[PDB]
Design a protein around this ligand. Structure first.
Ligand SMILES: CCCCCCCCCCCCCCCCCC(=O)OC[C@H](COP(=O)([O-])OCC(O)COP(=O)([O-])OC[C@@H](COC(=O)CCCCCCCCCCCCCCCCC)OC(=O)CCCCCCCCCCCCCCCCC)OC(=O)CCCCCCCCCCCCCCCCC
Ligand SMILES: CCCCCCCCCCCCCCCCCC(=O)OC[C@H](COP(=O)([O-])OCC(O)COP(=O)([O-])OC[C@@H](COC(=O)CCCCCCCCCCCCCCCCC)OC(=O)CCCCCCCCCCCCCCCCC)OC(=O)CCCCCCCCCCCCCCCCC
Ligand SMILES: CCCCCCCCCCCCCCCCCC(=O)OC[C@H](COP(=O)(O)OCCN)OC(=O)CCCCCCCCCCCCCCCCC
Ligand SMILES: CCCCCCCCCCCCCCCCCC(=O)OC[C@H](COP(=O)(O)OCCN)OC(=O)CCCCCCCCCCCCCCCCC
Ligand SMILES: CCCCCCCCCCCCCCCCCC(=O)OC[C@H](COP(=O)(O)OCCN)OC(=O)CCCCCCCCCCCCCCCCC
Ligand SMILES: CCCCCCCCCCCCCCCCCC(=O)OC[C@H](COP(=O)(O)OCCN)OC(=O)CCCCCCCCCCCCCCCCC
Ligand SMILES: CCCCCCCCCCCCCCCCCC(=O)OC[C@H](COP(=O)(O)OCCN)OC(=O)CCCCCCCCCCCCCCCCC
Ligand SMILES: CCCCCCCCCCCC(=O)OC[C@H](COP(=O)(O)OCC[N+](C)(C)C)OC(=O)CCCCCCCCCCC
Ligand SMILES: CCCCCCCCCCCC(=O)OC[C@H](COP(=O)(O)OCC[N+](C)(C)C)OC(=O)CCCCCCCCCCC
Ligand SMILES: CCCCCCCCCCCC(=O)OC[C@H](COP(=O)(O)OCC[N+](C)(C)C)OC(=O)CCCCCCCCCCC
Ligand SMILES: CCCCCCCCCCC[C@H](O)CC(=O)SCCNC(=O)CCNC(=O)[C@H](O)C(C)(C)COP(=O)(O)O
Lengths: 192, 78, 117, 93, 183, 70, 155, 75, 80, 108, 105, 60
C-alpha cells in the first residue's frame, strides 16, 4: 500500500480548497468544460435527430456546464482529500500543514480554530462529516466546523524535522493554548 | 423591446422587474425568505460591533469541581 | 352541526386573541393594578374579581374577532372555489414558508434563541 | 372473453321464440322469421328486441330491413358479443 | 415536560388503571448500623426561596457529595451515605437560621412564590427584602456563577418581564421599608 | 389532495425543531434550512408544470376565418 | 374492568361483516382511535397527538377524498360470534409468564435539573445526532412530490 | 507492456468489425471506426494491465500474512 | 386462531381495502416501537417511531396516486 | 378449510375470490388423506429409525412410499391402483435421495 | 460512536451505564476473545427487562404458598387508588382518612 | 504454487460467539446533548481509556 503521513483524518472544507495543487484546478477546469464537450461528442457519435450532426441547443450547453462545474469540483475535492488522509502523496502538504499548525501554536491560538459549537456538538459534527468523501459521489457532505476530532497527536508538531529549524518558532505547552480540550476544563469538569 | 421577456444572463436587473410586476407572489416570497440567510451571515458583524454572546447555559448536570476530594473536610458529623 | 360551526367561530376568534393579541393579558398594567388594588388579597372576593378582569380582557379581544367574523361577511362577496385552492398553495403557502425561515434567522443573528423558563 | 358459442345461442334462442306466437314450434337455423313464423313488422320487432335483452347485443338500423332468417341472428350474436367491463373491485383483488 | 414514567404519580387515575399501578409502602427503617439523620422537612416554596442561601452555606458539602458520586464508580447510594448526611444537616441549618433570624422576610418571599407559580421573576420585591436581611444576619450573598457581577438578573433595575399581578404583601412590605430603611 | 400528504408531513416534521430551537444552536438551524431547500425544489417543480391549476382545455377554442379563393 | 377490550371486540365484529368501502374506511378510524386513546393514557402522550395530527389529519381525510372518486355500488350470525369467541380465548401476544404477571418500578433521580419535553430531546438528536436521517426523509418527500405528479397528471 | 496493449488494440478492432455485421454494412465502411475502437480498447487495456499489476502487489502481501496464520494451525 | 389466517376474512374485497390493511399493519409496528422506547426510557426508539409515521405517510400517498390514475384509466375515454 | 368457506360468502359474484379459493380448495378426502399420510409418515419414519439405530435412505424410502400410498389411496381413489403405486414409489425416491444426500446440509 | 439509550431529558437513561461497559469490554485490545464480556452482556439485558429478577419473584410468590404463608403478613402494604393516599395511611400524626386532592395541582 | 495459493485464500477461519469482527472504533457516551452526567452510572473514564482494538489491514 502507498501510505503517507496522516495530515488530518477530517480535513476542513476551507483547508481542502486551500491546498488545491495547480493540477487540481486543471482537473476542475477539464470537468467544467468536459461536460459541454461530452454532449457535443455524443452528437458526433450519434445525432439526437436525423442522420446529420447538429449542435445541441445553447440552453443545454449552459446547464451542462453547471453539471460539469459542480461535477468537476468534487474530483478536485476528492483529489485534495486523499492527500490529507494519507492515501496520496503529501510531501508538499505536510510542509504546509506543519507550518500553519506551528504558527497557530506559536501565537497561542488553537490549530483548529474557535468554534460556535459546544463540546458535544463538536463531537457530533465530527462523526457526521468524517470520511464523508467516500460517499461524495453519491451525495455531498463537508466538514465546515472547527471541531477537534482530527485523529492526531499534537506533540507531533513539537519536534523539529529536517528543514524546519529556520522558521524560529517557539511553542508553549499544550495546557496554555486557547480552544483545546486539555486547556478548557480548569474549573468544572462538566463545562468548558 | 416594448414588452419583451428579459433575458436573465443579459439583463439581470430588468429580469427581476418582470417577475416583480407580473408574478408578485413569487418575487416577494423569496425576498422575505432571503433575509433569513442574509441576517444569519451578518452575525459576525454583530459579534464585534453591537454585543458579545451570552455564556452557555449550565445544562450538563451539577457542575463538578475539577479537583480531588478534600480529606480535611470535617464538621456536620454524627 | 350549526352549534359546531359557531363554536369554531368563537374558538378561532379566541385563538387569534391568544396568539397575536396577548390572550388574557391586560390592555394596560397601570389600570389593571389600580382595579386590583381595591380588593384585599386575603378575601376570596379578590379572586372573583381577578378572574373577571383577566377573562374580560380575553373576552374583549375575542369579541372584536367575533365582531370581525360578521364584519367581513357583511362587506365581502364570495370567492370562486377554484381560486381558493390556487390562493393558499400559490400565495399563502410560500409566504408562510418564508416567515418560518425569516424568524429563526433574525433571532439567531442577535443571539436571542428562545428558551422555556 | 366471449363465452358464447353457436349452439349456446341456438339453444336459448328457441326458448324466447317459444315465448311468442309462432306458427310452428320447430325452429332451427334454416327457419325464417317473416315466412315460417308469420310475423309482420310489429310482431317481429318484439322478438328481435327480446333477443337483444337475453343475448345483450344491439342490432343497428342497417340490419333492420336486412333480416330474413333466424340463423343470421344466431350467428350475429357471436360476432358481436363482449363482456361488460368490470370495475376495479371485480377485476383484480 | 410531563411524560408518564414508572417512578412517580402519573397524570390521571385512568393511567394508573391501565397500568394496574400499585403504590407500595415499606414499613421497615434503615438498618441499625446506618446512623440516623433528621430529614429536611421543607416543601417546594420554602426550598425554591432558600435554594441560593442553602448553596452559599453548604457549598463545600454539596460538592463533596457530588464528587463522592463520581468517585464511587456507579456505587453512589451505598458509598456516599456518610457524605449524604453532611448535606442534609447543613441544609437543615439554613432553614432553622432563616426561621429564627429572617422569619418575617422568609415567609413573605416563598408565600409570594406560592402566589405566582414559583417563578423567580414574579417576586423581586419580596426577594430584595430577604437578600438585604440575610446579608445583615448570616453573611450569605446570592450569586449566579458564570456571568459578571453587574449582569445578574435579580439586580436588573428594569426587568423586561414583570408579574401580571402584583403581590399586595410584597408591595406593602417594600413600601414600609422604602422610607424607613432606605431613607 | 395528493400533494397535501407530502407538504403536511414536511410541516408536521418541523415539530422537533420548535421545542429544541435553542439547544441545537446554529447546527440545527443550518440543517433545518437544508431540510426546507430540498422541499423547496418540490415546491419549485409544482410551480413550473402548473400542476395545481384546474385548467380549461375541453373548451374555449377559437379560429380565424380565412378565404380560400379558387 | 378495562373498557378498552369491549371496543376492540366491536371492531373485531364490523371488520368481518364489512361489505362496501364505507365500512372499510370506518375500520381505519375505529382502529386509530383505540390506538390514540390507549397511547394518551399509559405509554406516550406526545405520540397520541402525533397520530391524530398526521394519521387522521393527513391520510384519513385523503382516504375519503379518493374513495368518493372510486365507486359506490350495492355464514350467518352464529359463525361470526363463534369465530370471535374462539379468537378471544388467548390474548397474550408474549409467552414470558414471569415478565407478564410480575410488576416493576423505577427509582426517580434528581440529577436532570434541565427538565425538557420528549420532543425537545428528539429535536436535539434528529437535527444534530442523526441529521442524515432527516435529510434523507426530506429527499424521499421530494421524490413523492415529483412522483405523485407524474403518475396522475395526464399531460 | 506493448505486447499486451497491442492485444487489446486488436480486440477493439474486432468489436468494430463485429459491429458492422450487426449493422449489415460492408466492413470497409468508414474505416476510422476501427481506429477509434482500437484507441478506445487500448485505453481500457492500459487501465486493465495496471489493475492486474496492482493486484499482484496486493495479493502477495496478503499471502504472507496467510502463510503465518497457516503455520500456527500447522503446529 | 391466527395460524388459520383468520385476518384474511377481516379484509374487505376492494383494492382500497387492501391499502387500509397495510397501514393498520404498519401502525402495529409503530405502537410496538413506542411501547419499547417508552419502557426503556429511550428517545432513540421514539425517533424511529417518528420516522415510521412519516415514511408510512408517503407510502399512502403513492399508493392512492397509483390507484387514482388506475381508476381514471378505465373512465379515460373522454369523447366529449 | 372453514376460513376459506367464510370467504366465499363475503363475496361470490366476484370471479377473482372464487378463482383463487378453488386453488386452495381441499377436497373432503384430502382433509383426511393428508393428516393420515403426514401422520403415518412420521410414525413410520421414527419406527424404522429405532431398529436401524439412525435414519438412513432405506428407512426414509420405505416410510415415504408407504405414507404416500396410504395417503394416495384416500384422495386418489378414482385412478388405477398401478398409477397410485408408481406415484407412491416415485415420492419415496425423492425422500430417499434427500436422505442419502444428507438432508439439506452435511453439517459437521 | 452513536448514542443509544438516551433518557427523556437528553442524558443517559437507567440502562446506558450497563451498555457502555459492554462496549468498553468488547472493543478493548487486551481480550483474546469475547468470553470475558459474557456477564456484562447478561446484565444489560437484565437492566432492560428484569426477566431474571421477575423469575425470582415468581418463585417467592410460588414458595410462599407451599408453607401456608399469607401475603397479608409477608407482603408489602400497598394502596391501589391515587385519591385514597390518605394522611392517616401516610402516617401523619393528625391525619384523617379523607380523600386527598388530586383533581388539579 | 497455484495450488498452494488457492489453498490459503479458500480457507475460511472459524468464527463463533467468541471471535468475530466488530467495527466499533470508540466508546459512546462521552458527550450527551444535555445532562451529560446523569445517574453517575457511566463508569468508563475517557481520560484513562485503555487502547482500543485496531483493525488488521491485511494489505499493509
Ligand atoms: C439565480 C438565477 C438563475 O441563475 O437561474 C435563473 C432561472 C432562469 O429561468 P427563466 O429565465 O425563467 O427561463 C428562461 C430560460 O428558458 C431558462 O433556461 P436556461 O437553459 O437558460 O437556464 C436554466 C438553468 C437551470 O436551472 C437551474 O439550474 C436552477 C437551479 C436551482 C436554483 O441553467 C442555467 O441557467 C445555468 C446557470 C444557473 C445555475 C444555477 C445554480 C444555482 C446553484 C445551485 O430561473 C430559476 O431557475 C429560478 C430558480 C430560483 C427559484 C427560487 C429558489 C428559492 C430558494 C431559496 C428560498 C429560501 C431562501
Ligand atoms: C440524500 C439526501 C442528501 C442530503 C444532503 C444535503 C446537503 C449536504 C451538504 C451540506 C453539508 C451539510 C452540513 C451542514 C451542517 C454544518 C453546520 C455547522 O457546522 O455550523 C457551524 C458553522 C460555524 O461554526 P464554526 O466551527 O465556527 O465555522 C466557522 C466557519 O464557518 C468555518 O471555519 P473555517 O476555518 O473552515 O473558514 C472560515 C473562513 C475561511 O477561513 C479560511 O481558512 C480561508 C480559506 C481560504 C478560502 C479561499 C477562497 C474561498 C472563496 C473566497 O470562512 C469560510 O470560508 C467558511 C467556510 C464556508 C465557506 C462556504 C462553504 C460552502 C460549502 C458548499 O456554521 C457555518 O457557518 C457553516 C457555513 C457554511 C454554511 C453551510 C454550508 C453547507 C450548506
Ligand atoms: C457564507 C459566510 C460564511 C462565513 C461565516 O459567516 O462563518 C464564519 C463565522 C465565524 O466567524 P467569527 O465571527 O470569526 O467567529 C466568532 C466566534 N465567536 O461563523 C458564524 O458563526 C456565522 C454563521 C453564519 C453562517 C450560517 C448561515 C449561512 C447561510 C445559511 C444557508
Ligand atoms: C361518535 C360515535 C358514532 C358511532 C356511529 C356508528 C356506530 C356504529 C358502531 C360503529 C363503530 C364500531 C367500530 C367499527 C367501525 C364501523 C364499521 C361499521 O361497519 O359501521 C357500521 C355502521 C352501522 O351500520 P350496521 O347496520 O351496524 O352495519 C351494516 C350497515 N349496512 O354503519 C356505518 O357504516 C357507519 C356510518 C357512519 C360512519 C362514521 C365514521 C365511523 C365512526 C367514526 C367515529 C367512531 C369511532 C369508533 C368508535 C368505536 C370504537 C370501537
Ligand atoms: C386453546 C388453544 C388455542 C391455540 C391456538 C392455536 C390452535 C392450534 C392451531 C394449529 C396449531 C398448529 C401449529 C402448532 C404450533 C406451531 C408448531 C410449533 O410451534 O410446535 C408445536 C408442535 C409440537 O412442538 P414440540 O415438539 O412440542 O416442541 C417442543 C420442543 N422442546 O408442533 C407440531 O408438531 C404441530 C404439527 C405441525 C406439523 C404438521 C403441519 C405442517 C404441515 C401443514 C402446514 C400447512 C401449510 C403450510 C405451508 C408453508 C408455506 C410454505
Ligand atoms: C391447502 C394447503 C395450502 C398449502 C400452501 C403452501 C404454500 C407454499 C406452496 C409452495 C409452492 C408455492 C406455490 C404457490 C401456492 C400454491 C397454490 C396452491 O396450492 O394451489 C394448488 C395448485 C392448483 O391445483 P389445481 O389442481 O390446479 O386445482 C385444484 C382445484 N380442485 O396446485 C399447485 O400447482 C401447487 C403446487 C405448486 C408446485 C410446488 C412445488 C414445490 C417443489 C415441490 C417438490 C420439491 C422439488 C425438489 C424435490 C426433490 C428434492 C427434495
Ligand atoms: C423411479 C421413478 C418410478 C416411476 C414409476 C413410473 C412407472 C409408470 O409407468 O407409471 C405409470 C403411469 C404411466 O402411464 P402409462 O405408461 O400410459 O400406463 C398406463 C396403463 N394403463 O404413470 C402415471 O400415470 C403415474 C405415475 C407417475 C409417477 C411419476 C412420479 C415419480 C416422481 C419421482 C421420479 C423419480
Ligand atoms: C482518441 C481516443 C478516444 C477514442 C474515441 C472514444 C469515443 C469514440 C468517439 C469517436 C467519434 C465517433 O464516434 O465518430 C463516429 C463514428 C462513426 O460512426 P458510424 O457507425 O460510421 O456512423 C456513421 C457515421 N458517418 C456518417 C460519418 C459515416 O463512430 C465510431 O467511431 C464508433 C466507435 C464506438 C466507440 C469506441 C470507443 C469504445 C470505448 C470502450 C471503453 C469501455
Ligand atoms: C468477426 C469477429 C468474430 C470474433 C473473432 C475472434 C477475435 C479474437 C480477438 C483476440 C484478442 C486478443 O488477442 O487479445 C489478447 C490480449 C492480450 O492479452 P494480455 O493483456 O497480455 O493478457 C494476457 C492473457 N494470457 C495470460 C492468457 C496470456 O488480451 C485481450 O485483449 C483480452 C480480451 C478481452 C477479454 C474480455 C474480458 C475483459 C473485460 C472484463 C469484463 C468482465
Ligand atoms: C450414487 C448412486 C448410488 C448411491 C448409493 C445408493 O443409492 O444406495 C442406496 C441408497 C442408500 O441405502 P442406505 O440406507 O444408505 O444403505 C444402508 C446404509 N449403510 C450402507 C450406510 C449401512 O438407498 C436409496 O434409496 C437411495 C436413493 C437413490 C438416490 C440416488 C442419487 C444418485 C445421484 C448421483 C450422485 C452422484
Ligand atoms: C313509457 C312511456 C311510453 C309512451 C309510448 C308513447 C307511444 C307514442 C305513439 C306514437 C304514435 C305516433 O304518433 C304514430 C306512429 O307511431 S308512426 C306510424 C304511422 N304509420 C304511417 O303513417 C304509414 C306507415 N305505416 C307503417 O309503416 C306500418 O303501419 C307500421 C308502422 C306498423 C310498420 O309495421 P309493419 O308494416 O307491420
Amino acid at each position: 500500500m502507498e501510505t503517507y503521513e496522516l495530515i488530518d483524518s477530517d480535513p476542513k472544507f476551507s483547508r481542502v480548497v486551500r491546498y488545491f495543487r495547480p493540477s487540481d484546478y486543471l482537473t476542475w477546469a477539464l470537468g467544467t468544460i468536459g461536460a459541454p464537450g461530452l454532449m457535443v461528442l455524443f452528437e458526433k457519435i450519434e445525432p439526437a435527430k436525423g442522420n446529420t450532426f447538429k449542435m445541441p441547443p445553447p440552453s443545454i450547453m449552459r446547464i451542462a456546464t453547471t453539471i460539469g462545474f459542480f461535477g468537476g469540483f468534487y474530483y478536485a475535492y476528492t483529489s485534495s482529500t486523499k492527500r490529507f488522509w494519507g492515501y496520496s502523496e503529501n510531501a508538499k502538504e505536510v510542509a504546509k500543514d506543519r507550518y500553519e499548525v506551528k504558527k497557530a501554536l506559536s501565537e497561542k491560538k488553537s490549530p483548529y480554530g474557535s468554534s460556535l459549537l459546544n463540546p458535544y456538538q463538536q463531537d457530533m459534527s465530527a462523526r457526521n462529516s468524517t470520511n464523508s468523501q467516500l460517499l461524495l459521489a453519491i451525495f455531498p457532505w463537508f466538514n465546515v466546523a472547527n471541531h477537534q476530532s482530527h485523529g492526531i497527536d499534537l506533540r507531533k508538531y513539537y519536534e523539529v524535522r529536517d528543514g524546519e529549524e529556520n522558521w524560529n518558532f517557539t511553542l508553549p505547552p499544550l495546557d496554555q493554548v486557547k480552544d483545546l480540550d486539555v486547556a478548557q476544563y480548569k474549573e468544572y469538569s462538566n463545562y468548558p | 423591446a416594448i414588452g419583451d421577456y428579459p433575458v436573465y444572463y443579459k439583463q439581470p436587473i430588468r429580469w427581476l422587474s418582470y417577475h416583480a410586476h407580473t408574478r408578485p407572489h413569487v418575487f416577494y416570497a423569496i425576498a422575505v425568505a432571503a433575509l433569513g440567510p442574509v441576517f444569519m451571515m451578518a452575525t459576525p458583524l454583530r459579534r464585534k460591533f453591537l454585543y458579545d454572546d451570552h455564556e452557555p447555559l449550565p445544562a450538563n448536570g451539577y457542575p463538578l469541581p475539577n479537583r480531588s476530594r478534600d480529606k480535611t473536610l470535617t464538621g456536620y458529623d454524627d | 352541526f350549526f352549534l359546531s360551526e359557531y363554536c369554531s367561530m368563537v374558538l378561532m376568534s379566541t385563538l387569534t386573541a391568544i396568539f397575536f393579541f396577548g390572550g388574557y393579558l391586560p390592555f394596560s398594567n397601570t389600570i389593571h393594578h389600580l382595579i386590583l388594588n381595591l380588593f384585599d388579597q386575603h378575601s376570596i372576593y379578590y379572586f372573583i374579581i381577578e378572574g373577571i378582569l383577566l377573562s374580560g380582557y380575553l373576552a374583549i379581544k375575542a369579541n372584536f374577532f367575533m365582531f370581525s367574523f360578521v364584519w367581513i361577511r357583511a362587506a365581502a362577496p364570495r370567492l370562486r372555489y377554484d381560486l381558493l385552492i390556487l390562493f393558499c398553495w400559490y400565495v399563502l403557502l410560500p409566504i408562510v414558508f418564508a416567515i418560518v425561515v425569516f424568524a429563526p434567522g433574525i433571532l439567531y443573528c442577535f443571539d436571542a434563541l428562545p428558551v422555556i423558563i | 372473453a366471449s363465452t358464447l358459442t353457436k349452439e349456446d345461442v341456438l339453444t336459448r334462442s328457441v326458448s324466447v321464440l317459444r315465448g311468442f306466437e309462432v306458427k310452428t314450434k320447430d325452429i332451427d337455423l334454416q327457419t325464417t322469421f317473416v315466412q315460417d313464423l308469420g310475423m309482420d313488422s310489429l310482431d317481429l320487432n318484439d322478438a328481435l328486441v327480446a333477443l337483444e335483452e337475453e343475448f345483450d347485443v344491439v342490432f343497428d338500423d342497417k340490419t333492420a330491413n336486412e333480416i330474413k332468417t333466424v340463423g343470421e341472428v344466431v350467428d350475429f350474436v357471436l360476432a358481436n358479443y363482449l363482456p361488460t367491463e368490470q370495475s376495479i373491485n371485480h377485476t383484480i383483488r | 415536560s410531563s411524560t408518564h414514567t414508572n417512578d412517580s404519580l402519573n397524570s390521571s387515575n385512568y393511567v394508573d388503571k391501565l397500568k394496574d399501578t400499585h403504590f407500595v409502602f415499606e414499613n421497615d427503617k434503615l438498618p441499625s448500623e446506618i446512623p440516623d439523620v433528621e430529614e429536611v422537612g421543607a416543601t417546594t416554596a420554602p426550598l425554591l426561596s432558600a435554594a441560593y442561601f442553602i448553596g452559599a452555606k453548604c457549598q463545600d458539602y454539596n460538592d463533596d457529595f457530588m464528587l463522592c458520586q463520581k468517585e464511587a464508580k456507579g456505587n453512589g447510594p451505598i458509598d456516599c451515605l456518610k457524605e449524604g448526611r453532611r448535606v442534609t444537616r447543613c441544609a437543615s441549618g439554613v432553614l432553622k437560621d432563616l426561621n429564627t433570624h429572617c422569619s418575617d422576610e422568609f415567609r413573605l418571599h416563598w408565600q409570594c412564590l406560592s402566589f405566582s407559580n414559583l417563578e423567580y421573576k414574579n417576586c423581586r420585591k419580596a426577594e430584595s427584602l430577604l437578600n438585604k436581611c440575610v446579608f445583615e444576619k448570616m453573611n450569605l450573598v446570592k450569586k449566579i456563577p458564570g456571568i459578571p457581577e453587574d449582569r445578574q438578573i435579580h439586580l436588573k433595575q428594569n426587568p423586561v418581564l414583570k408579574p401580571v399581578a402584583l403581590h399586595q404583601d410584597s408591595e406593602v412590605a417594600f413600601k414600609k421599608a422604602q422610607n424607613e430603611n432606605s431613607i | 389532495a395528493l400533494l397535501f400528504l407530502p407538504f403536511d408531513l414536511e410541516v408536521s416534521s418541523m415539530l422537533p425543531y420548535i421545542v429544541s430551537i435553542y439547544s441545537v444552536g446554529i447546527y440545527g438551524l443550518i440543517i433545518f434550512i437544508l431540510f426546507l431547500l430540498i422541499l423547496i425544489v418540490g415546491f419549485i417543480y409544482e410551480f413550473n408544470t402548473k400542476s395545481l391549476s384546474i385548467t380549461t382545455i375541453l373548451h374555449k377554442k377559437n379560429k380565424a376565418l380565412v378565404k380560400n379563393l379558387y | 374492568m378495562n373498557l378498552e377490550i369491549l371496543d376492540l371486540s366491536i371492531l373485531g365484529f364490523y371488520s368481518l361483516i364489512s361489505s362496501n368501502s364505507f365500512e372499510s374506511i370506518a375500520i381505519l378510524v375505529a382502529t386509530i382511535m383505540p390506538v390514540i386513546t390507549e397511547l394518551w393514557y399509559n405509554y406516550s402522550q406526545l405520540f397520541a397527538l402525533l397520530y391524530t395530527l398526521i394519521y387522521v389529519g393527513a391520510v384519513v381525510i385523503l382516504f375519503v377524498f379518493i374513495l368518493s372518486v372510486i365507486n359506490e355500488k350495492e355464514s350467518g350470525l352464529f359463525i361470526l360470534i363463534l369465530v370471535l369467541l374462539l379468537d378471544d380465548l388467548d390474548d397474550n401476544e408474549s409467552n414470558d409468564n414471569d415478565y407478564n404477571n410480575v410488576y416493576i418500578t423505577d427509582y426517580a433521580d434528581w440529577f436532570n435539573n434541565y427538565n425538557e419535553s420528549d420532543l425537545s430531546v428528539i429535536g436535539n438528536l434528529l437535527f444534530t445526532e442523526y441529521a442524515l436521517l432527516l435529510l434523507i426523509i426530506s429527499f424521499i418527500l421530494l421524490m413523492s412530490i415529483i412522483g405523485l405528479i407524474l403518475i396522475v397528471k395526464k399531460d | 507492456m506493448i505486447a499486451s496493449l497491442a492485444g487489446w488494440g486488436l480486440f477493439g478492432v474486432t468489436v468494430r468489425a463485429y459491429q458492422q455485421g450487426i449493422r449489415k454494412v460492408p466492413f470497409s465502411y468508414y474505416p476510422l471506426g476501427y481506429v477509434y475502437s482500437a484507441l478506445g480498447w487500448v485505453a481500457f487495456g492500459y487501465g486493465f494491465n495496471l489493475w492486474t499489476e496492482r493486484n499482484d502487489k496486493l495479493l502477495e502481501k496478503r499471502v504472507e500474512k496467510l502463510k503465518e496464520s497457516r503455520n500456527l494451525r500447522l503446529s | 386462531m391466527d395460524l388459520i389466517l383468520l385476518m384474511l376474512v377481516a379484509v374487505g374485497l376492494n383494492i382500497i381495502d387492501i391499502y387500509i390493511m397495510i397501514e393498520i399493519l404498519i401502525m402495529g409496528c409503530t405502537v410496538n416501537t413506542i411501547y419499547s422506547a417508552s419502557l426503556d426510557n429511550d428517545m432513540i426508539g421514539l425517533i424511529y417511531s417518528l420516522i415510521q409515521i412519516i415514511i408510512a405517510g408517503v407510502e399512502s400517498a403513492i399508493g392512492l396516486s397509483i390507484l387514482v390514475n388506475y381508476n381514471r384509466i378505465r373512465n379515460s375515454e373522454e369523447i366529449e | 378449510h372453514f376460513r376459506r368457506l367464510m370467504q366465499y360468502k363475503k363475496g361470490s359474484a366476484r370471479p377473482g375470490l372464487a378463482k383463487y379459493l378453488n386453488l386452495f380448495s381441499l377436497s373432503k378426502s384430502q382433509l383426511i388423506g393428508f393428516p393420515v399420510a403426514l401422520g403415518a409418515f412420521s410414525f413410520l419414519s421414527h419406527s424404522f429409525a429405532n431398529l436401524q439405530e439412525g435414519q438412513t435412505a432405506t428407512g426414509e424410502f420405505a416410510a415415504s412410499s408407504i405414507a404416500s400410498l396410504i395417503g394416495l389411496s384416500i384422495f386418489r381413489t378414482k385412478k388405477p391402483l398401478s398409477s397410485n403405486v408408481a406415484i407412491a414409489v416415485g415420492m419415496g425416491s425423492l425422500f430417499g435421495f434427500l436422505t442419502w444426500a444428507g438432508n439439506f446440509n452435511l453439517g459437521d | 460512536a452513536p448514542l443509544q439509550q438516551v433518557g427523556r431529558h437528553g442524558g443517559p437513561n437507567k440502562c446506558f451505564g450497563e451498555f457502555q461497559r459492554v462496549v468498553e469490554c468488547m472493543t478493548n485490545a487486551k481480550h483474546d476473545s469475547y468470553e470475558p464480556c459474557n456477564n456484562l452482556k447478561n446484565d444489560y439485558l437484565e437492566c432492560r427487562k428484569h426477566k431474571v429478577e421477575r423469575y425470582k419473584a415468581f418463585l417467592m410468590q410460588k414458595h410462599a404458598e407451599e408453607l401456608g404463608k399469607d401475603p397479608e403478613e409477608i407482603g408489602a402494604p400497598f394502596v391501589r387508588k391515587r385519591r385514597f393516599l390518605t394522611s392517616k395511611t401516610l402516617g401523619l400524626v393528625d391525619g384523617d382518612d379523607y380523600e386527598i386532592g388530586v383533581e388539579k395541582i | 504454487s497455484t495450488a498452494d495459493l488457492y489453498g490459503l485464500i479458500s480457507f475460511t477461519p472459524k468464527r463463533d460467539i467468541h471471535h468475530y469482527v466488530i467495527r466499533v472504533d470508540e466508546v459512546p457516551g462521552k458527550h450527551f446533548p444535555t445532562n451529560t452526567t446523569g445517574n453517575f452510572g457511566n463508569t468508563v473514564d475517557f481520560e484513562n481509556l485503555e487502547p482500543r482494538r485496531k483493525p488488521i489491514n491485511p494489505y499493509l
